């Protein structure tokens, strides 16, 4: 029941996801 | 299929002697052929094994020098020459067929058996 | 890592470990022999690299 | 030379039970064992071949396992024609050899 896994105002942050 | 053994005996130690296995019931010219040996009362031992074209021919530890192994195609016939005998050389002498029983053909195997031939090396009367 | 691991658990308890995003270099565990036995049933070694 | 020595040299049981013959190789030779059947005053028969594929016409009791190094005849359920004394034979390379004998006695 568990997977992998990946490890690693005055501005404005755009994401698409 | 079928191998018939001859040649055995009584021989007398340091002398030679021929075992033939003829061969039917298959293409014999295209299989490897092997000699093995069974001393009284004892285990196998691998004796001499020839190509099926007679060029190559390998045998074991104890023989080399002394036995040759030979071929003829014509009459599909098995033959060694053992020379040199000596008392731990009496073994019933079985002469065998490469084989391999199916697809699984890079296992290449051992198969059918003759009947065996007893071999004595003796000084007796 | 996995084969030089210092202790293997108990055959009760078998860890299993996870790989992914890793390139894996079958060939070297091949061409490597002190493994006693090398089965292999699903894919043929040689076409595991 | 590759040598194969087999465990037991003997063993005793009775008909029904479940055997396991051993044979291994100085050197690794993946999957070339040859088992063989022989009975006293004939020649041996030939049962597991690839030391993991059953021959036309053996029961298919009889089974073989293994790769490498180790190996392993089972014979899941015995009975009184199974007695007898049993080969282990490597092929990948010559000269060819045959490991020490099994016997399998009644018990
Ligand atoms: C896909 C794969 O690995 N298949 C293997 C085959 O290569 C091998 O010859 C056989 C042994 O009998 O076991 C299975
Ligand atoms: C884990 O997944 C399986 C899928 O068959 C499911 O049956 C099981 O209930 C899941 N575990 C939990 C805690 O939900």
């Given at each position: 029941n568990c997977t992998f896994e990946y490890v690693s105002f005055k501005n404005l942050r755009e994401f698409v996801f | 299929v079928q191998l018939v053994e001859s040649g055995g005996g009584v021989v007398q130690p340091g002398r030679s002697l021929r075992l033939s296995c003829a061969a039917s019931?298959?293409?014999?010219?295209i299989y490897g052929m092997h000699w093995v040996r069974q001393a009284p009362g004892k285990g196998l031992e691998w004796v001499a094994v020839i190509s099926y074209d007679g060029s190559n021919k390998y045998y074991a530890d104890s023989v080399k020098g002394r036995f040759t192994i030979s071929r003829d195609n014509s009459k599909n016939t098995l033959y060694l020459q053992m020379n040199?005998?000596?008392?731990?050389?009496?073994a019933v002498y079985y002469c065998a067929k490469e084989g391999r029983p199916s697809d699984i053909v890079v296992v290449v195997a051992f198969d059918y058996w003759g009947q065996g031939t007893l071999v004595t090396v003796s000084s007796a009367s | 890592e996995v084969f030089n691991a210092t202790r293997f658990a108990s055959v009760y308890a078998w860890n299993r470990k996870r790989i992914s995003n890793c390139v894996a270099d079958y060939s070297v565990l091949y061409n490597?022999?002190?493994?006693?036995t090398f089965k292999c049933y699903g894919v043929s070694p040689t076409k595991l690299n | 030379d590759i040598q194969l020595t087999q465990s037991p040299s003997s063993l005793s049981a009775s008909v029904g039970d479940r055997v396991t013959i051993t044979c291994r190789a100085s050197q690794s030779i993946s999957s070339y064992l040859n088992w063989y059947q022989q009975k006293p005053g004939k020649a041996p028969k030939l049962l597991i071949y690839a030391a993991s594929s059953l021959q036309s016409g053996?029961?298919?009791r009889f089974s073989g396992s293994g790769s490498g190094t180790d190996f392993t005849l089972t014979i899941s359920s015995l009975q009184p024609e199974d007695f007898a004394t049993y080969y282990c034979q490597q092929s990948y390379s010559t000269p060819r050899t045959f490991g020490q004998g099994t016997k399998v006695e009644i018990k």
């Open positions: - | 019931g298959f293409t014999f010219s040199s005998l000596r008392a731990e050389d009496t | 490597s022999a002190s493994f006693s | 053996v029961p298919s």
